[PDB]
Structure formats: C-alpha cells, structure tokens
C-alpha cells in the first residue's frame, strides 16, 4: 500500500517464558482460607496466629519511606534476591 516491502524468512516463535522467569513455586502450594463475609475477613486477618507481612519484612517505623520487602529464593544454586516496595508517610 504505497510502501515497498522486503522479503524475509519466518522468525522463531517465542512466548513470555522464553525470556522471563516464572517466580511461582511448583513444589510448595500455599493454601488459602475460605470466607465471603467482610466482618469475618477482619477477624481472620487479625488472629495472632497468622501474619501477612513478617516483622523482618517491614521497615515501617521510619521518618518517611516505609518499605515492605520480599525475597526470591533460587532453588538450584541457592542464591537469593531481595525486593522492596516503598510507601510514603509524608
């Protein structure tokens, strides 16, 4: 359509999994608790026996810039990688 094209060969089909790592464990399936009530939900999360974010994964008590962290564990060569998430308190 008014533009001249150049012939070329078919290319290698690729998907996301070709280049990028899936960071979901295929060995450990974390299970979840039932519930469809919202008042019940508050009671479930506030039980002293559970934790959403571990205390070592929370730099909340700072003068601004509260961060919450996570760790990616490589299960082959056993190297880890820490990821943060920055919140504002200003």
């Amino acid at each position: 359509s008014a533009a001249y094209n150049t012939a070329t060969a078919p290319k290698v089909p690729v998907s996301r999994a070709t280049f990028f790592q899936n960071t979901k464990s295929k060995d450990f399936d974390f299970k979840f608790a039932d519930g469809a009530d919202a008042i019940a939900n508050v009671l479930q999360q506030m039980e002293h026996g559970v934790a959403q974010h571990q205390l070592g994964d929370m730099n909340v008590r700072t003068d601004g810039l509260a961060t919450v962290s996570a760790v990616l564990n490589g299960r082959k060569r056993k190297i880890a990688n820490q990821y943060m998430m920055h919140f504002d308190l200003f």
Partner: protein, 49 residues
Amino acid sequence: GILNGDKAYEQVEMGNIRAYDAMFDTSAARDFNFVGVRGASQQIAAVGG
C-alpha cells in the same frame, strides 16, 4: 532416608508459626506421616549441626 536437594523445603517461611515442621501439612500424603516431617526436620537441622 536421604534428604533432598531438588526442592527448597528449608526456605519456606511462614509468619507466627513457631515450629518449622508445623508449616507443613501431611494429611493428604499417602506415603508420609506426622512423624516423617519431625524426622526430616531433625535431619535438616543436623546438617547445620
């Protein structure tokens, strides 16, 4: 018998669970028992001394 290296069972971490082997659920396992995780944990820890 011999422990495993193909899985990262030593890196599983859960909040406000005080025992290591209380993180794991062997009710559905047909080949594994409540004393098989306690024994596995004793061998896991003995590696580190």
